[PDB]
């Protein structure tokens, strides 16, 4: 919910343009004059002043004027809470922006409540099982991963996957991305079998999309290697996400002792 | 007087920074208007070339 | 000559301010002309790509 | 006449100065001048161009001393960079002369106008229609000074160009013959002005109803016949002529002639 109004569009791009060229001496004053032009007409407490302040704070983020950027975003959220009301998407967008600024400075705990309030705002407007609520749960999981809150990471990624897998298709990359992230969280907890099953699920859907339903012949890539451990190969290296899975599960078979299985999986990933 | 001079020097510098930023943007905006007016003259030619081609096709089919 | 210095600073501050406000006025007007042109170039790009497809539709 | 890169800014200045947004126009000009000296240096055709634009905005404001100074500086740059006897130099002299005349400095504007006419003649040719427009303008500067002989010479030269280079039906020709006749009336060259008026009326009549024959006599010739007692041309120049020749007939005692000519003009 970060819609930039028609008027500010050109000036906004010009700001971004100058702030990318590292022409801060031009960008900051353009922002500052635009703010005075906005209060002349609209008054401080306005959605456009809030928009214009958020832009400047991101220019102060680029400069590493982190205290200025934080203050500017607090003022912007304050305007957005009056004008647009609390529990507004613009209010959610600002809290996420403020949490991203805090995480950057390593203030992960400080960024945690902001992220939690925004997810609460997202759930109210979009619905509990909305795909954007899933993107928020994923972001809140990263926040906990950085704090080493292993259990919290698993809960958040588990909630996210619930939304992704049911609301979107199984073939969706967001689903595979979550299952790989959650499996990683499991590996940290020592929930090896849980992560292994997750990897297998990924590989099995990939295989099914390529070569229809799994029957007697046309067994998946993993199932071919696990059978190889007792003694041709058609495997598609379509996605980078599918390689991470192949490499991961391979290493996991090396831990199990199923070395030939780890090998063939490594080879398919190499191919 | 000294306090007043200091404040005027601060304000003069702030004003100068803004004036030069505004001059930079104004120059860039003129060049974008010139690039656009030239590009619209190109497109106006392309549209009136195809408008004549509309009649040329109908004379055959 | 603190008084002489103040007078000069006030003159320069006013000159600067007049120019800043004139530049701001022009910049705003220039943005509106860029917006009117970018919108007008979209109508024309749409019109040209509509007739480019109509070229093939007539030939068929 | 304006260089490529300056074109947009120049229009923007004219637009703001026309809207009467002087507070915008003057500073835009002033900043552009500093941006031009940064790169080019004071003595440059672009600084000269930019200064001429500003002094014309100062004319509109009635900052006449500023406008004069600015134009003197611009002509000074134009003499170095473009050289003396350059059209840009001629344009500036005309500008300074128009500014002087407005203030009533007619004598001061007189040499400037004379130098520009000299430049015009060199580049365009002695009998060019723009040389005629210049001679007319210079003739007007002498009229304001009350230099009757000078006015007659300049309007006589202008008419020579107009009448030969352009057609007889041209309005510039009738305009000059009316202005020159007026100058004659001031000198007391009554018969000369009378003949001039008659010439105007006679060409007008001929364009409308072919060549003058026995039956088809002009408007004046009909009134001169009326004085020995027994038209509706929507041209404003042709009315001035009718009224003026009537005024002459009124002074000549040929009142019926003054009357019919006044009436035709009324119609």
Author numbering:
A (entry chain A): 191 to 421, 438 to 477
B (entry chain D): 417 to 477
C (entry chain C): 416 to 475
D (entry chain B): 193 to 422, 441 to 477
What does the study report here?
Kinesin-1 transports numerous cellular cargoes along microtubules. The kinesin-1 light chain (KLC) mediates cargo binding and regulates kinesin-1 motility. KLC comprises an N-terminal heptad repeat region that oligomerizes with the KHC stalk, an acidic linker region, and a tetratricopeptide repeat (TPR) domain containing six TPRs (TPR1-6) (Gauger and Goldstein, 1993, Verhey et al., 1998, Wong and Rice, 2010, Zhu et al., 2012). The KLC TPR domain (KLCTPR) is unusual in binding to multiple ligands using distinct sites (Hammond et al., 2008, Zhu et al., 2012).
To investigate the molecular mechanisms of kinesin-1 recruitment and activation by JIP3/4, and how this is regulated by ARF6, we determined the crystal structure of the murine KLC2 TPR domain (KLC2TPR) in complex with the murine JIP3LZ to a resolution of 3.2 Å. The crystallographic asymmetric unit contains a single copy of the complex, which comprises two copies of KLC2TPR bound to one copy of the JIP3LZ dimer, which adopts a parallel coiled-coil conformation. The KLCTPR binds JIP3LZ end-on, via TPR1. This was unanticipated, since TPR domain ligands usually bind to the concave inner surface. The KLC2 TPR1 α helices pack flat against the side of the JIP3LZ, lying across the JIP3LZ helices at a ∼90° angle, and oriented with helix 1B proximal to the JIP3LZ N terminus. This buries 571 Å2 of surface area on each KLC2TPR. The KLC2TPR binding site spans heptad repeats 2–5 (residues 433–435, 437–442, 444–446, and 450) of the JIP3LZ. The JIP3LZ hydrophobic patch is recognized by a number of hydrophobic side chains that line the inside of KLC2 TPR1 (Leu201, Leu204, Tyr208, Val216, and Leu220). Around the edge of the hydrophobic core of the KLC2TPR:JIP3LZ interface, the side chains of KLC2 residues Thr200 and Tyr208 (TPR1 helix A), and Gln223 and Asp227 (helix B), hydrogen bond to the side chains of JIP3 residues Asp450, Asp444, Lys435, and Asn439. Comparison with the crystal structure of the ARF6:JIP4LZ complex shows that the KLC and ARF6 binding sites on the JIP3/4LZ overlap, consistent with KLC and ARF6 competing directly for binding (Montagnac et al., 2009).
